[PDB]
Design an enzyme around this catalytic site. Sequence first.
Site, PDB file in Angstrom:
ATOM      1  N   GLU A   1      36.034  45.722  40.239  1.00  0.00           N
ATOM      2  CA  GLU A   1      34.999  44.688  40.265  1.00  0.00           C
ATOM      3  C   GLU A   1      33.729  45.242  40.919  1.00  0.00           C
ATOM      4  O   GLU A   1      33.278  44.791  41.972  1.00  0.00           O
ATOM      5  CB  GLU A   1      35.508  43.449  40.993  1.00  0.00           C
ATOM      6  CG  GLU A   1      34.639  42.210  40.818  1.00  0.00           C
ATOM      7  CD  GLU A   1      35.093  41.049  41.682  1.00  0.00           C
ATOM      8  OE1 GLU A   1      35.947  41.265  42.567  1.00  0.00           O
ATOM      9  OE2 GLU A   1      34.597  39.921  41.477  1.00  0.00           O
TER      10      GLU A   1
ATOM     11  N   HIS B   1      39.109  41.069  36.610  1.00  0.00           N
ATOM     12  CA  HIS B   1      37.736  41.511  36.377  1.00  0.00           C
ATOM     13  C   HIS B   1      37.683  42.794  35.554  1.00  0.00           C
ATOM     14  O   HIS B   1      37.259  42.766  34.394  1.00  0.00           O
ATOM     15  CB  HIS B   1      36.987  41.676  37.705  1.00  0.00           C
ATOM     16  CG  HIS B   1      36.898  40.411  38.501  1.00  0.00           C
ATOM     17  ND1 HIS B   1      37.751  40.124  39.544  1.00  0.00           N
ATOM     18  CD2 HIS B   1      36.065  39.348  38.395  1.00  0.00           C
ATOM     19  CE1 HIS B   1      37.442  38.944  40.053  1.00  0.00           C
ATOM     20  NE2 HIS B   1      36.423  38.452  39.373  1.00  0.00           N
TER      21      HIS B   1
HETATM   22 ZN   LIG Z   1      39.468  36.545  42.016  1.00  0.00          ZN
END
Ligand SMILES: [Zn+2]
Lengths: 493, 491
Positions: free
Chosen positions: A337, A362
Site C-alpha cells: 500500500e 490494496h
Molecule cells: Zn485495511
Amino acid sequence: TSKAAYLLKRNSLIEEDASRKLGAKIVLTNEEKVLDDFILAEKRKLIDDSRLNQTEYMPAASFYRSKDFIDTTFAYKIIQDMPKGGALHLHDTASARIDWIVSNATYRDHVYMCMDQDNFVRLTVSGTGPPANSGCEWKLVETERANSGDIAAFDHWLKSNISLLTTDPLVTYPSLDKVWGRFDKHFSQLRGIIYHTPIRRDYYRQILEEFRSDNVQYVEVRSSLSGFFELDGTVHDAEFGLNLYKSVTEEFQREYPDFIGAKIILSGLRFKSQEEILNEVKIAMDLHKKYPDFFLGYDLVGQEDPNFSLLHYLDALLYPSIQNPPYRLPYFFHAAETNWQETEVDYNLADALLLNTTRVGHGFALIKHPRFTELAKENGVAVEVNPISNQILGLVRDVRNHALVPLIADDYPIVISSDDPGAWEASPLSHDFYVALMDLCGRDTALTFLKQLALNSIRYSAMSDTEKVAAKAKWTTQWDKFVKTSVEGLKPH
Amino acid sequence: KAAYLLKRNSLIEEDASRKLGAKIVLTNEEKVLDDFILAEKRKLIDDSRLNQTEYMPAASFYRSKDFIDTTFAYKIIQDMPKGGALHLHDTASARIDWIVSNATYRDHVYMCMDQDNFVRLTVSGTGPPANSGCEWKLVETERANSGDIAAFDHWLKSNISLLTTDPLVTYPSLDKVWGRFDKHFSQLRGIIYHTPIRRDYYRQILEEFRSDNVQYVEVRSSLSGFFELDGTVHDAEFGLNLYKSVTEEFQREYPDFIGAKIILSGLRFKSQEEILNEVKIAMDLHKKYPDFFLGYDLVGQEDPNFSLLHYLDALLYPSIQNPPYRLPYFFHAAETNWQETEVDYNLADALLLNTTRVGHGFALIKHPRFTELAKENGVAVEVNPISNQILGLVRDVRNHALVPLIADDYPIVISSDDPGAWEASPLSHDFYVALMDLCGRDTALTFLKQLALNSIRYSAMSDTEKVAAKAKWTTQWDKFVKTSVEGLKPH
Ligand SMILES: [Zn+2]
Ligand SMILES: *[C@@]1(O)O[C@H](CO)[C@@H](O)[C@H](O)[C@H]1NC(C)=O
Ligand SMILES: *[C@@]1(O)O[C@H](CO)[C@@H](O)[C@H](O)[C@H]1NC(C)=O
Ligand SMILES: CC(=O)N[C@@H]1[C@@H](O)[C@H](O)[C@@H](CO)O[C@H]1O
Ligand SMILES: CC(=O)N[C@@H]1[C@@H](O)[C@H](O)[C@@H](CO)O[C@H]1O
Ligand SMILES: *[C@@H]1O[C@H](CO)[C@@H](O)[C@H](O)[C@H]1NC(C)=O
Ligand SMILES: *[C@@H]1O[C@H](CO)[C@@H](O)[C@H](O)[C@H]1NC(C)=O
Ligand SMILES: [Zn+2]
C-alpha cells in the site's frame, strides 16, 4: 482493398485486446443488455462531453467534491440497487455511520466529552464517576447539550468534528503524513465510546443493517476483538468479542434470510512488539480451531510505510507452520500500500506470497514487480482493491492513474471493497463500485465488469466450496430480481 | 528459518533480474559511481518514509528544481554521456534566455501585451506589425523607458515562461495548463520563425544538448514557414537544408558529436487534405535526403483533437503504390488517462502502420495485446517524465504508467519533450527524475547505462551507422567513468 484489409486487421487487433479484460467472458441476456446500455449511455456522456467540451471529469475528483455529484447520477441509483456480492475488506470501527454515534450513543447515560489539546472532541463512557484524566476537562454530554440552545447545532458540530469529509481532505491535510494524522485522530476520538460493550454490540448490528440496506449480502470484517469494557470497569478478552459478533450475526441471519452471512478476521497493529504479535497469532490459532467457520485468519493493519514490515514478524508468522504436525493459520495481509519501489513496504508482497496468503489488501505496488504478479495469479491470490481509500489516504489523486487498472484489463484475480467507509461518509459499497465503473475500466466496459466483480467476491472469498455454491445461488436470486425490477421501471410497456 | 530465507531471496532475484539493464555488467570502476548514486538515492527515500516528510524528487518540478540543483547525484548525471535524445520539439529545445538576451536585442523586433495580459514578440522589417488588436511597440523603446534594464528582461521571461508560478497550482486543470502551453508557442511564433533567428536557435539547440553530454538528437519540426525581413515564406526543403547545413558545420567543429536527424511534424487539427500534402512532401524528402530525413509524425494535444484513423487515407498512401514505398513513422500515441477511447486506441493504428517508435505511450500498459506486439516488432516508447507531470497526466511521478514496463525490460528511451518551455535541462533533468521516481531503490547505474545504449540501438540510424555511433559513445563513456572515479575515490 488496402483500406479494407487494414480495417479487418485493426478490428481483429482491438477485439483481441479487449477480449482479455475482466468480464470479457460474461455473456449477458438481452434483459441485462438493457441495463448495460443505460449505464454505458451516462458513462459515455460524461467521458466524451468532458473530453471534447474540455471540462473536469467529476467522477475522478476528490470524494468531497464528487459525492454530491455522484448522489445525483441516474447510474448510482442502479448500483445502489445492485446486489454487489460481498465486501471482503472492512474495518469494524469505521464500517457504520457517524450519525448513529451522534444520535444514539452520545444520548446514552454516562457519556462525557472533552476538547483535547489539538482542538478535537473526544468521547468516552465512565460509570465510575467522572473520567480520570486532566489533559481533558470532561463534561457530561447530556448537560452540555441542554445548556447550548440549539440541540441540532450541538449534534451537527459533533459530526463535523469527528468526520474526515467535513473539509476536503486533499486540501486540509495535503500530505500523506497529515491525512494519516487526521485518520488516526478519528479513531482516538471515538475509542472511549465504541469499545463500551453495549454501544459496540449495537454498533456492529448497525454495520450489518446498513450493508444489507446497500444490497450487500456478505461481509468479511477485520476486528481487534479485544478490549471491550463495561460500566463496572471489567475489560474482556478476544473470544468474548468474537462471540459477541457471532451472536449478533446469527440473530441477523435468522431475521433476514436474504443475507448470506458474515465472517471475522483478527487484526493486529504493525507497531506493536513482536512478542504481542506472536501472542495474537496464538489467539488466532485457537480461535480458528474453536470457531472454524466464523473465524478466517490473521492480518496486520496500520500505516504501512512508517511502521514495521512483514519480515520483522517472521518468527511469529512462521510459528503456525513449524509446529508438529504443521498447522495452517490463513493470512489476509495488507501488502504494498505504497508508492515506493524495491523497499521494505514494496517487498512485503514476497513475504505474503511465501506465507501463502489467501488474499492481498490494496496491493498497489504489485504491477511494479513482474514475477510477483505472475506468481500470485498462478497460485490464485486475489487483490482487494479499495479505490476511495487509496485517494483520500494519498496514493493517487486521479483515480484513472490507479496502479491496478492495467491488471484489471488482463483478467487478474481482483475484488472491490471499501476500507473505512464511515470515516469519510461514504456508502457501504455503492460509492466504491461507482468509482470503479467510471474510473477503473474502459469506455466500452460497464456491466460485464460489475457482474464479474460480484462473482469474484464469492469465488475469491474464504467460504468453503460448498458454501460458495450455496452463496452464489442467493446472490443469483437477488440479482435477477434486481434486473427484472430495473428493466421493468425503465423499458416502456 | 534459513530455508524460508533462501526461497525469499531466490524469488526477489527472480523478479529483479527482469529490470531494464539487469544484464549490464559493470566494471569495478563503474561500480564505484553506482554506489555514490545509490547512497544519496536511499537517503532521500528513507528519510521521507520514516521521518514522514516530503520526497521532493516526486514533487512538482517548480518546487523540486531548486532542490535538485543542490544534490550530488545531479552533477554525476550532468557529466554523463547519455547517448541520444529521441523525442524533441524544435521550437522549445533551447533556452528562453537565448530569446531574451539575443533575439529581443536584434533589430526589427516588436512586442505587445495581448488581451490575456501575456507578452507577444514578432519580427517585422517593413515597419510596425500588420495588426491592431495589439498596440505593438519596439522592444528597444519599452526597454529604454524602464527604470531597470534587467527587470524588463526578467519580466520578459517571467511573463512568457511556464515555471514562473507553480503550474500545478495556478493552472490546475488539463485544459488550463494546456492553454498556457499553447499560449507559450503563440507568444514566440513571430520571432522563432524568422529565418536568421531560427537558424541560430537550432544552433543553440545542438550546442546546448552537446554541453549536457548528449551526443545525438532526433528532432521533430514543422520545417516550413521560415520568413525573411522582406516577407518571403519558404517551403520545407529550405528548412531541411537549413538544418542540414548547420548540423554538418557542427559535426565538423566538434568531432566528438554523432549527429542529428529530422522528423516532419503536422498538427492534429488540420484537414485531411493538408495532412495528405504533408505526407507526400515527406515521401520525397525521404528519397532525396535518405540519411538526414527519417519520417513523419502528427503532434498537438491528443484528447480534444483528431485521431490517427481520421487520417488513414494519407498515412497509407506510401503503401498503396507500384512499386510500394515505405515512409517511416514516429507517431505520438495515447498521451491520455482515458481508457478504451478514440485517443487511447491510436496505438492499434500506430502498430499496424509499422511505426518505428511511439511517443509517450502513457496508456500502453492498459492494453495487454498491444504491448506484446510492439515488443516482438521492436517498437520502443519515448518516456518523458517532466512533460507528463506539468501537462497533467500524473502528479506524483512515482505513479507513472510506464514504471511496470521498465521493470520487465521493455524497449524504452528517455527524452525531454519541450525542455525550454518549462525551464528544464536538455536531458539531465529528465534523467534524474527517471533515476529517483521511475526505478526501484536498488537500481542506479545499470538502468542509466541501458538507457544510453537503448538510444543508439532504438535510433533511426543504419546498422552501419549504429556501430560507429556506439563506438563514439563508448570512448566518451569510459572517459566519464575514469574522470568521475578519479575525482571521488581516494588515491
Ligand atoms: Zn485495511
Ligand atoms: C530521519 O528520520 O531519518 C534519517 C534516517 O532515515 C536519520 O539519519 C535522521 O536523523 C532523521 N531526521 C531527523 C531526526 O531530523
Ligand atoms: C546572437 O545572440 O547569437 C548569435 C549566434 O546564434 C550571434 O551571431 C549574435 O551576435 C548574437 N546577437 C546578440 C545581439 O547577442
Ligand atoms: C475556536 C474554533 O473555531 N474552534 C473550532 C472547534 O470548535 C472545532 O471543534 C474544531 C474542529 O476541528 O475546529 C476549530 O476551529
Ligand atoms: C504455513 C506457511 O506459511 N506455508 C505453508 C508451506 O509451509 C507449505 O509448503 C505450503 C504447501 O502448499 O502451504 C503453506 O501454507
Ligand atoms: C440505539 O440502538 C439500539 C440498537 O441499535 C437500540 O436498542 C437503542 O434503544 C437505541 N438508543 C437510543 C438512545 O435511541
Ligand atoms: C504578467 O503576466 C502575469 C502572468 O504571467 C499576469 O498576472 C500579469 O497581468 C502581467 N503583468 C502585469 C503588470 O499586468
Ligand atoms: Zn511530443
